[PDB]
């Protein structure tokens, strides 16, 4: 069983099949199982390598639990490796998990493909292990974490080959011309999107035949719509046609050993605002190892002044000896190095998560050759996470161990700060990938523990099989249970301090749940955290947070890509202040008549499916039940009615009839309709110049000849029959079994397939910009609802992840038949499932990292940070790898009557259910505003242009009653707050933008 | 002078710029080179997001400086 698709589904769209075949054969060894080691291990086991081996004979101590989510108070005194092994072993049945007992041997060691050295391994020992790996051809990765600082180092050996540097779909495009000197012009307007030094192959270039060989050509970019490939004079002369496809080519790269890299490092920066720090921390991290050697393996003590001075001397000595490393003339950054000393014993969940997600991905890179490895060193810090010293003073007393799983967090932040985290009241909206990682971080934070705090998590989803791969709080046995409930349970198992402290709810968060999530609910909270996977719901929450003035932590992922965003009341723009690029719109005519990509034929197959088995049934049942359905339709007209007469006089009586139907539909859509198109626009028609009509995006199609042995012809009929059976409530002959080929064959073999008669008057449009896009006959040939009383059609509810329901079967077959029509490569059902079901690629790796960065932003909220420059919006692509940060954007400021206001966060507050006349007067005697317009949602309540009839009927009414009147039926019921929007003229008579209104009932 | 714009997809765009050039300006050069409307372009440099109203020199952009074109991602 090469790659279980029901488990590795989403991950399979991120990594290839080929790369996972390569992972499936790698053995990984992780050295040290404290917080960092167990993160890496979790992410790697979930991804599914050949085997995971683990080394940590050190005894479990209390303080380890700071970030080690797989240890408990009971495990203390036992070997970290032994105790984690079993827990890791539960994550992925496909990956065996072993403990290694000693490291003195070679025969074991040389069997591993990747070795990861963790914070528990000293720099001396790191240099030795890397040396053995390098010279052995074993990939080596190391990483350490120390308070708000971290680094990773990658050595993949003298020879490594990257198979695909980016993981991006290869570029593709239509050729308009190839000139003798190898200049390829794109088809009018199409961008190639290529880059100098990309490689490209060619198809369908009529005239230069051997050019379509599969031979690749180096690309020299001329502009957005043209590129050169060198002379093609020797292949012939271009005539017509042509498709380029980018091809990724193997790149051999060479890595240096740790020993080499220590004195001549190569960096990848974690934060470009902080580039001058890499060289500094590179020296810093070497210094705290020189410190340990000098102080019998001990790190500098917490917030200790003497030890910091020593560390500054060590770094200084490094730079005197190598002036090149900081740079000639460059001074030692003493306040940075001081901080490294101060925090060296710190163990921060946010930092560990970040390095775990990212180191884990490097491991996967090292197994597969997929994506671009980190070229050697990266340093990180999140010093902006430190609280303001004046409110949470950090010193030796404040910061000392108090015998608690949290004291390596206290090591950095102080007791009082750590206590304030415990006392937070938070809302987590969603319990999927980010949810699980988040709750996990929170457990380690102790967030919501302690009498004044708590956690609310909601998610209406139950646990699905395809989710286990990145939602690591769930087990195969939990599928079908509710996400939030299982996650709260699982997290209290990690940290019992959260028992009776997490309220796990199972409700959606939108218009329909405002009773349960009322003002009292929201007002109570300190901040809100998004763990969602769609935009509508992100927008709903963003609206609530601005109304209630609560901080919002946002984050999202797509494959190796991830982002993080902070919304701070009266400070930043909110989520909605910004819009992402829309889904690229496909021209109606391209879908309808001129597909040239598999995306085009899927979309078409998907709407066809919805036509056949959803909208047909709905329309019929609406027709049958409702009194005035027909007239309402009149007031999207012809097709509606046709759906209701075909669907009512074409009723199947058995499954046989459904086979016939589907087989006839096959002839309609892939033979007759194609022949009509070719009748409409003959194969040889020529537009301006002498250019064929069928050129560029218009591929001349060829009608299908039904062939049962063809996988797409066969499955279109099978899926088609079964779904029609389902509409009409007929026992399928496949319902029990595998589709019986000889059955379908015998039926189809006995059918009259009526031949094609072209329509000489029906015109198909070519462009969307073109005009133009028998009635009563269709009407009173509808056989009266009375003839069909008690009869219903059963509508299909598209369910993409149920492989037995024929949905994806249908879309795949239907798309591929149309793809056959127009000479497009057919797609498998997993690729169709991805596109039709709009599935988002996800991996645990990017999810940990992103959750980590969120939690480093969390500390800033706890300190009620006022300075915008302290906050970091995060952007990430682990494929490259790339990390970048931007300070959030300030909330837009407005002005009215020389009075400044925040356009997002400012509002007029009004006590009681005020009369409309009082409202207007209050705004004149207090704010210099006359009301042009007053509205509650989409309803207009008041406007200065209203007649004196409507004026005096409404002027006297309280807002409650005013809303009862305008809304044909409205009475609030449980609402204590009302938002009103306003248009006003200022003190000078001109129109002004103005804060909204809140009426407190 | 030359600046470099790197996309999240790992594509590098060279641009021909003046120190005085607006952010509005740089963005339409992206639109020319890449097709992305300025509306959807999010540029970051040295820890700051580049806002329309301002110019290059404001954010201390130099020759050979690297900008990054970024994105919010739905799903989690
Ligand atoms: O003493 C102590 C730290 C080291 C330099 C600044 N103050």
Strand content of chain B: 25-35%
The description of the largest β-sheet of chain A is: 8 strands, mixed
Which CATH C-level class of the largest domain in chain A is it?
Mainly Alpha
CATH overall fold name of chain B: Ubiquitin-like (UB roll)
Cα-based radius of gyration of chain B, to the nearest Å: 12 Å
Straight-line N-to-C gap of chain A? 63 Å
CATH architecture of chain B: Roll
Helix proportion of chain B: 10-25%
As laid out across the biggest beta sheet of chain A, the strand order is 19-18-17-20-21-22-23-24
CATH homologous superfamily name of chain B? Phosphatidylinositol 3-kinase Catalytic Subunit, Chain A, domain 1
**Strand adjacency order, main sheet of chain B:** 2-1-5-3-4
CATH topology of the largest domain in chain A: Arc Repressor Mutant, subunit A
Q: List bound small molecules.
A: proline
The CATH level-2 architecture of the largest domain in chain A is identified as Orthogonal Bundle
Helix content of chain A: 25-40%
The number of helices of chain B is 1
How many discrete domains of chain A?
6
- Alpha carbon gyration radius of chain A: 33 Å
> What is the tally of beta strands of chain B?
5
Helix/strand order of chain B? EEHEEE
Largest sheet composition of chain B: 5 strands, mixed
């Amino acid at each position: 069983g090469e790659i279980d698709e029901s488990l590795y589904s989403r991950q399979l769209y991120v990594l290839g099949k080929e790369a996972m075949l390569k992972m499936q054969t790698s053995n990984v060894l992780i050295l040290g199982l404290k917080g960092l080691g167990v993160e890496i291990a979790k992410n790697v086991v979930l991804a599914g390598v050949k085997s995971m081996t683990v080394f940590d004979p050190e005894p479990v101590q209390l303080a380890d639990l700071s970030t080690q989510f797989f240890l408990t108070e009971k495990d203390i005194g036992q070997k970290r490796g032994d105790v984690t092994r079993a827990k890791l072993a539960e994550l992925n049945a496909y990956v065996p998990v072993n403990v290694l007992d000693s490291l003195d041997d070679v025969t074991q060691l040389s069997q591993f493909q990747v070795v990861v050295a963790t914070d528990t391994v000293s720099l001396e020992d790191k240099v030795k292990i890397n040396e053995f790996c390098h010279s052995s051809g074993i990939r080596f990765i190391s990483s350490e974490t120390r308070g708000l600082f971290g680094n990773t180092f990658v050595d993949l050996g003298d020879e490594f080959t990257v198979l695909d540097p980016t993981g991006e779909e290869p570029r593709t495009g239509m050729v308009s011309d190839i000139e003798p000197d190898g200049t390829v012009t794109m088809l009018d307007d199409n961008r190639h999107g290529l880059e100098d030094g990309n490689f490209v192959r060619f198809s369908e270039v009529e005239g230069l035949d051997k050019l379509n060989d599969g031979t690749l050509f180096k690309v020299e970019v001329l502009g957005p719509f043209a590129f050169r490939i060198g002379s093609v004079k020797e292949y012939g002369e271009y005539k017509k046609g042509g498709i380029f496809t980018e091809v990724k080519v193997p790149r051999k790269i060479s890595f240096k050993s740790l020993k080499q890299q220590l004195s001549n490092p190569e960096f990848v920066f974690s934060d470009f605002a902080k580039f001058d720090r890499a060289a500094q921390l590179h020296l810093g991290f070497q210094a705290l190892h020189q410190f340990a050697v000098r102080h019998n393996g001990e790190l500098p003590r917490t917030m200790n002044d003497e030890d910091a001075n020593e560390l500054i001397k060590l770094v200084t000595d490094l730079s005197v000896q190598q002036p090149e490393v900081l740079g000639e003339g460059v001074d030692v950054n003493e306040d940075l190095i001081k901080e490294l000393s101060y925090q060296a014993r710190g163990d921060i969940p946010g930092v560990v998560a970040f390095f775990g997600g990212l180191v884990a991905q490097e491991v996967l890179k090292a197994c597969s050759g997929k994506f671009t490895p980190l070229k050697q060193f990266m340093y990180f810090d999140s010093l902006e996470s430190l609280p303001d010293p004046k409110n949470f003073p950090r010193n030796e007393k404040t910061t000392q161990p108090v015998n608690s799983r949290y004291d390596n967090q206290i090591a950095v932040f102080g007791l009082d700060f750590q206590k304030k985290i415990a006392n937070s009241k938070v809302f987590l909206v969603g319990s999927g990938a980010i949810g699980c990682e988040m709750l996990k971080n929170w457990a380690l934070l102790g967030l919501g523990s302690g009498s004044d705090g708590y956690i609310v998590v909601t998610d209406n989803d139950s646990i699905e099989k395809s989710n286990l791969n990145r939602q690591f709080l769930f087990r195969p046995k939990d599928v079908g249970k509710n996400k939030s409930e299982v996650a709260a349970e699982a997290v209290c198992a990690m940290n019992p301090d959260l028992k009776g402290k997490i309220n796990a709810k199972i409700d959606k968060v939108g218009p329909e749940t405002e009773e349960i999530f009322n003002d009292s609910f929201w007002e109570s909270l300190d901040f809100v955290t998004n763990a969602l996977d769609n935009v509508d719901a992100r927008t709903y929450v963003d609206r609530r947070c601005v109304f209630y003035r609560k901080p919002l932590l946002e984050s999202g992922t797509l494959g190796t890509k991830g982002n993080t965003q902070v919304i701070i009341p009266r400070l930043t723009e909110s989520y909605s202040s910004s819009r992402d690029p829309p889904e690229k719109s496909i021209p109606l005519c391209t879908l309808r008549s001129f597909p040239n990509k598999i995306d085009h034929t899927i979309a078409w197959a998907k709407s066809l499916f919805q036509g056949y088995f959803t909208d047909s049934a709905e329309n019929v049942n609406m027709y049958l039940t409702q009194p005035n359905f027909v007239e309402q339709t009149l007031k999207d007209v012809k097709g509606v009615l046709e759906s209701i007469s075909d669907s009512l006089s074409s009723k199947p009586h058995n499954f046989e009839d459904c086979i016939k139907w589907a087989r006839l539909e096959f002839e309609k859509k892939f033979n007759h309709d194609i022949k009509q198109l070719l009748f409409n626009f003959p194969k040889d028609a020529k537009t301006s110049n002498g250019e064929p009509f069928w050129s560029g995006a218009k591929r001349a199609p060829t009608p299908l000849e039904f062939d049962i042995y063809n996988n797409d012809h066969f499955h279109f009929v099978v899926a088609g029959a079964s779904l029609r059976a389902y509409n009409y409530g007929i026992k399928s002959d496949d319902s029990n079994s595998k589709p019986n080929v000889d059955e379908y064959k015998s039926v189809i073999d006995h059918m009259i397939i009526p031949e094609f008669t072209p329509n000489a008057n029906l015109k198909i449009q070519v462009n969307d910009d073109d005009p133009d896009p028998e009635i009563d006959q269709l009407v009173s040939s509808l056989p009266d609802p009375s003839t069909l009383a008690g009869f219903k059609l059963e509508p299909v509810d598209f369910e993409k992840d149920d492989d037995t329901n024929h949905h994806i079967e249908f879309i795949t077959a239907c798309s591929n038949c149309r793809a056959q029509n127009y000479f497009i490569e057919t797609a498998d059902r997993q690729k169709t499932k991805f596109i039709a079901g709009r599935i988002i690629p996800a991996i645990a790796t990017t999810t940990s990292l992103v959750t980590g960065l969120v939690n480093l932003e969390l500390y800033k909220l706890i300190d009620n940070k006022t300075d915008i420059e302290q906050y970091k919006n995060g952007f990430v692509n682990l494929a490259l790898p790339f990390f970048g940060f931007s300070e959030p954007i300030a909330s837009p400021k407005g002005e009215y009557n020389n009075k400044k206001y925040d356009k997002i966060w400012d509002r007029f507050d009004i006590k009681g259910d005020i009369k409309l006349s009082d409202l207007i007067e209050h705004f004149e005697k207090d704010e210099g505003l006359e009301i042009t317009m007053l509205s509650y949602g989409v309803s207009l309540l008041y406007a200065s242009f209203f007649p004196p009839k409507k004026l005096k009927e409404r002027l006297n009414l309280p807002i409650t009653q005013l809303v009862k009147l305008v809304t044909k039926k409205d009475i609030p019921a449980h609402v204590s707050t009302m938002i009103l929007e306003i248009c006003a003229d200022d003190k000078e008579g001109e129109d002004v933008e103005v804060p909204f209104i809140t009426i407190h009932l | 002078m030359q600046i470099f714009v790197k996309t999240l997809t790992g594509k590098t765009i060279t641009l021909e710029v003046e120190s005085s050039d607006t952010i509005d300006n740089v963005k339409s050069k992206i639109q020319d080179k890449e097709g992305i409307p300025p509306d959807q372009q999010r540029l970051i440099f040295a820890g700051k997001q580049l806002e329309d109203g301002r110019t290059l020199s404001d954010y201390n952009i130099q020759k050979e400086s690297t900008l990054h074109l970024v994105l919010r991602l739905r799903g989690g």
